[PDB]
Design a protein around this motif. Structure first.
Motif, PDB file in Angstrom:
ATOM      1  N   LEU B   2     -19.662 105.743  44.544  1.00 37.67           N
ATOM      2  CA  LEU B   2     -20.342 104.587  43.895  1.00 37.67           C
ATOM      3  C   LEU B   2     -20.910 103.672  44.946  1.00 37.67           C
ATOM      4  N   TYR B   3     -21.949 102.999  44.556  1.00 38.59           N
ATOM      5  CA  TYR B   3     -22.592 102.071  45.483  1.00 38.59           C
ATOM      6  C   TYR B   3     -21.699 100.815  45.326  1.00 38.59           C
ATOM      7  N   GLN B   6     -22.896  96.876  41.880  1.00 35.88           N
ATOM      8  CA  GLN B   6     -23.167  97.393  40.521  1.00 35.88           C
ATOM      9  C   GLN B   6     -23.541  96.251  39.615  1.00 35.88           C
ATOM     10  N   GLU B  42     -32.527  94.264  44.994  1.00 37.85           N
ATOM     11  CA  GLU B  42     -33.151  94.989  46.168  1.00 37.85           C
ATOM     12  C   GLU B  42     -32.152  96.003  46.775  1.00 37.85           C
ATOM     13  N   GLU B  43     -31.004  95.467  47.059  1.00 32.39           N
ATOM     14  CA  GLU B  43     -29.834  96.196  47.650  1.00 32.39           C
ATOM     15  C   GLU B  43     -29.528  97.495  46.924  1.00 32.39           C
ATOM     16  N   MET B  44     -29.560  97.357  45.637  1.00 31.00           N
ATOM     17  CA  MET B  44     -29.261  98.517  44.778  1.00 31.00           C
ATOM     18  C   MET B  44     -30.416  99.466  44.595  1.00 31.00           C
ATOM     19  N   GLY B  45     -31.558  99.111  45.102  1.00 25.89           N
ATOM     20  CA  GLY B  45     -32.739 100.024  44.962  1.00 25.89           C
ATOM     21  C   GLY B  45     -33.656  99.680  43.814  1.00 25.89           C
ATOM     22  N   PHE B  46     -33.491  98.505  43.271  1.00 26.18           N
ATOM     23  CA  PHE B  46     -34.368  98.084  42.134  1.00 26.18           C
ATOM     24  C   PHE B  46     -35.438  97.280  42.865  1.00 26.18           C
ATOM     25  N   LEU B  47     -36.562  97.022  42.266  1.00 26.11           N
ATOM     26  CA  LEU B  47     -37.585  96.266  43.043  1.00 26.11           C
ATOM     27  C   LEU B  47     -37.313  94.791  43.141  1.00 26.11           C
ATOM     28  N   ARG B  48     -37.006  94.267  41.998  1.00 31.37           N
ATOM     29  CA  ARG B  48     -36.726  92.828  41.894  1.00 31.37           C
ATOM     30  C   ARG B  48     -35.830  92.505  40.693  1.00 31.37           C
ATOM     31  N   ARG B  81     -28.365  92.314  53.768  1.00 29.77           N
ATOM     32  CA  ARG B  81     -27.273  92.862  52.909  1.00 29.77           C
ATOM     33  C   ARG B  81     -26.278  91.799  52.434  1.00 29.77           C
ATOM     34  N   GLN B 102     -35.370  95.025  37.573  1.00 29.95           N
ATOM     35  CA  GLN B 102     -36.423  95.844  36.899  1.00 29.95           C
ATOM     36  C   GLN B 102     -35.823  97.250  36.745  1.00 29.95           C
ATOM     37  N   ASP B 103     -35.814  97.772  35.553  1.00 30.80           N
ATOM     38  CA  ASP B 103     -35.247  99.142  35.294  1.00 30.80           C
ATOM     39  C   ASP B 103     -36.171 100.178  35.948  1.00 30.80           C
ATOM     40  N   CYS B 104     -35.588 101.270  36.350  1.00 32.26           N
ATOM     41  CA  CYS B 104     -36.355 102.329  37.002  1.00 32.26           C
ATOM     42  C   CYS B 104     -35.583 103.633  37.036  1.00 32.26           C
TER      43      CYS B 104
END
Ligand SMILES: NC(=[NH2+])c1ccc2[nH]c(-c3ccccc3[O-])nc2c1
Lengths: 247, 110
Positions: B2-3, B6, B42-48, B81, B102-104
């Motif tokens: 897990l990252y 979350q 951002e950290e989690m890989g979402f854009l914003r 981070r 933002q979902d992706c």
């Protein structure tokens, strides 16, 4: 894409086609309804009049009357892209945002610290040639290829030290399946469940290769994780920019 | 695998892993909530982060977290981070941050 198969609507909803004066030149991936991530080499001097570019989304057939086509407000390319092969990345800001539907969705970025898994099998998609001396695909194509280690790819029998640290190779030693001309700028995505839900993330951007699908000449991709901060910055910095700019 | 960061799909509360406990902790609400929400997505890989709000443990619950983490707002703007400007805290107001990123990366077909 050489050695791939036709795909259907909604499967890769982040895939877009970048067309200049009517022709499909590059692929791209939606990061949001108004930002597309692609390769810097898709904007050589002869293709820099923004009004002549269109982004086509929401359809897998290039001649679908049901896709949406929007203009370009700005293109931000990487200043370290010395040809203007490392730093072959650019962001495209659409003049207006696309609606997000079951056919138009953004793809995710690698999370901070998330590294590429050598050997992992990801998917690459595009409308590029299905044979080097072939024609572009009419319907979007998809192929699965594994990530290759830079130790292997930089060996004298593959690309003998031409793979720099911010790029990686993916393909089969045997050749047969690969990206090709017309696929540049598009997505190389890997799926993971680290956010507790399976999500597809953009790990690479189709950048280059010698010929297409030859044995020992795998496709090379821009490694997106290394440009995370550049992307976050660029968007903040240029959200209100118009034209070709560099970051 | 897990990252460490979350976000809940039920109410968007942010959860950050505490390795000394093997538990997730909530992020105590602060005046820098907007930047912390932005940085977390951002950290989690979402854009914003599209938006963020504040939840109350007394009305929303803990949802299986153990404690709070507080952000050093003075160091906040020097980071890339989240985990390096956070510390365990009491969070007396019992109010934490929820972030809608933002979902992706997901298909939306049946
Ligand atoms: N074999 C490959 N993996 C590959 C991928 C993308 C390419 N894009 C091109 C290309 C060729 C001429 C002009 C622009 C291009 O992107 N060749 C390419 C080759």
């Amino acid at each position: 894409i050489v050695g791939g198969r036709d795909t259907s609507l909604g499967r890769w909803p982040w895939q877009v086609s970048l067309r200049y004066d009517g022709a499909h030149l590059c692929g791209g991936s939606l990061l949001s309804g108004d930002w597309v991530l692609t390769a810097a080499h898709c904007f050589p001097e002869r293709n820099r009049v923004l009004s002549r570019w269109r982004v086509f989304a929401g359809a897998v057939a290039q001649a679908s009357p049901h896709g949406l086509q929007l203009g370009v407000q700005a293109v931000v390319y990487h200043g370290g892209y010395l040809p203007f092969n490392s730093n072959d990345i650019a962001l495209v800001h659409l003049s207006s945002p696309l609606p997000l539907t079951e056919y138009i969705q953004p793809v995710c970025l690698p999370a901070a610290g998330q590294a590429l898994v050598d050997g992992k099998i990801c998917t690459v998609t595009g409308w590029g040639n299905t044979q080097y001396y072939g024609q572009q695909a009419g319907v979007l194509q998809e192929a699965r290829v594994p990530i290759i280690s830079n130790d292997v790819c930089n060996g004298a029998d593959f690309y003998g030290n031409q793979i720099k640290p911010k790029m990686f190779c993916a393909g089969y030693p045997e050749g047969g399946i690969d990206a090709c001309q017309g696929d540049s700028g598009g997505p190389f995505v890997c799926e993971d469940s680290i956010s507790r839900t399976p999500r597809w993330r953009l790990c690479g951007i189709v950048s280059w290769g010698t010929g297409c699908a030859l044995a020992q000449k795998p496709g090379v991709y821009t490694k997106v994780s290394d440009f995370r901060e550049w992307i976050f910055q660029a968007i903040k910095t240029h959200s209100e920019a118009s034209g070709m700019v560099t970051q | 695998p897990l990252y460490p960061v979350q976000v809940s799909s039920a109410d968007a509360r942010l959860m950050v892993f505490d390795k000394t406990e093997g538990t997730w902790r909530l992020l105590c609400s602060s005046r820098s909530n907007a930047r912390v929400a932005g940085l977390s997505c951002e950290e989690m890989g979402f854009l914003r982060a599209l938006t963020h709000s504040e939840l109350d443990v007394r009305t929303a619950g803990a949802a299986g977290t153990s404690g709070f983490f507080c952000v050093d707002e003075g160091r906040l703007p020097h980071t890339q981070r989240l985990l390096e400007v956070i510390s365990v805290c009491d969070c007396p107001r019992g109010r934490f941050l929820a972030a809608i990123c933002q979902d992706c990366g997901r298909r939306k077909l049946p």
